[PDB]
Amino acid sequence: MKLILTAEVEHLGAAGDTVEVKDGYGRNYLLPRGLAIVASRGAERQAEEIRRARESKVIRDIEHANELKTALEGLGDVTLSVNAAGDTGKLFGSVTAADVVNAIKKAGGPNLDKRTVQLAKAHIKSVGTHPVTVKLHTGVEAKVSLNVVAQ
C-alpha cells in the first residue's frame, strides 16, 4: 500500500513523504516500527507524520541523559486538571498517561513518553497528592508527586 514516512529510510525516501511500497512494509517492518503510517487523509496524514517527527525526536534519551532527566524531574508538586466534584472527591474517569506527561510538562517542564509512566499502580481517582513512578532505563527511576485542585 501507500504510506507516509515519519522517519528517514535508506533507499526509500525522506520523512513526511507519501511513498508507494509493497505491503511487506505496511505489514511487517514500517507500520509496526512507527517509522511510517497509513496515508488516510492528505492534510491529516501529513500533519500526523510531521508532528510525530517532532515528539519522537524529543522523547529520545540516553543513560546519563536519563539520570539528568531524573534530576530535572526531581522537582516539586505537579498539578493536574481532571474533572471531580467536591461532593465526595471521587474522580470518575481514569487519569490517563497523557494527562500526567502533559501535567509534568506544565508543572516542571521536561518532556517524556506515556510508555514510561506507571499509571496502573498509582491507585488513581482519589483527590489529593499521590505518587507516580517513571522509568527510562533498567536502573534509573523518577518519583513524581502529582495532585489535583478542586473543581
Binding site: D23, R27, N28, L31, P32
Partner: protein, 63 residues
C-alpha cells in the same frame, strides 16, 4: 487448518471431475495462514489462524 479465526471462512465442497467425467467429492480450503498478531499497540503477540483475505484487508495488526 481450514477455518479462519477472524471471519469463520471454512472450506467449500465440490467435485473434481476427470476427462471421463468421473466426479468425486473434494474440498476448496481457505488460505488461512498462521498469523501472530497484536491486539494492543504495545506489541504482545498471540498466535491465531487468519485467512489471507483478512491479512490483506488489514483486519489483523501484525505489529
Amino acid at each position: 487448518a481450514a477455518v479462519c479465526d477472524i471471519c469463520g471462512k471454512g472450506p467449500g465442497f465440490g467435485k473434481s471431475v476427470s476427462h471421463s467425467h468421473r466426479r468425486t467429492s473434494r474440498r476448496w480450503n481457505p488460505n488461512i495462514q498462521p498469523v501472530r498478531a497484536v491486539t494492543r499497540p504495545g506489541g504482545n503477540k498471540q498466535r491465531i489462524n487468519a485467512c489471507t483475505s483478512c491479512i490483506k484487508a488489514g483486519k489483523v495488526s501484525r505489529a
